[PDB]
Design a protein around this nucleic acid. Structure first.
Lengths: 76, 79
DNA sequence: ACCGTAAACATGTTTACGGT
DNA sequence: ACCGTAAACATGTTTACGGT
């Protein structure tokens, strides 16, 4: 287990992007890649904890692309 | 009167979306607009019609979505 | 091809509880 | 006080089928 909260590990991913925005599936991939704990050990429930933290903490606001066909997560 | 209205789902959605000042509407306000302007969906239809409306929104490409600045409200808009 | 219906899966919103 | 974890509900994305 990594010594970071979900809110912490999520913002790490979003801050790692060029356009200060990240898709949910790209948040999973970033956490799986940068913390091998979630790729090999954690039960599939950790993706539920990720969605739970995003909607709850107000720092995570979403925004839609110009094409209006992709919904991103960004920090305020 | 509440007999079925002669409009497709895509049609009744555009009526709702275009009836706003900013050509935009939240999903719950689309249900409410169709329920209020066509009592068929308020008194008769089984809960599946809300599944078909969402189905129409995602499938037809003319229905694109837009988010508020507060990032806490998701709208449906036409381009 | 088009519309309507159903259902599975992905994603976003909430309440709820035990433990760090 | 609040995280971590679970589950129910709302919303968005898809494939699949029968009928006109």
């Amino acid at each position: 287990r990594p010594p970071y909260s979900y809110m912490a590990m999520i913002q790490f991913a979003i801050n790692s992007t060029e356009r200060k925005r990240m898709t949910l599936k790209d948040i999973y991939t970033w956490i799986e890649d940068h913390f091998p704990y979630f790729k090999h050990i954690a039960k599939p429930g950790w993706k539920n904890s990720i969605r739970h933290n995003l909607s709850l903490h107000d720092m995570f606001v979403r925004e839609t692309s110009a094409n209006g066909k992709v919904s991103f997560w960004t920090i305020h």
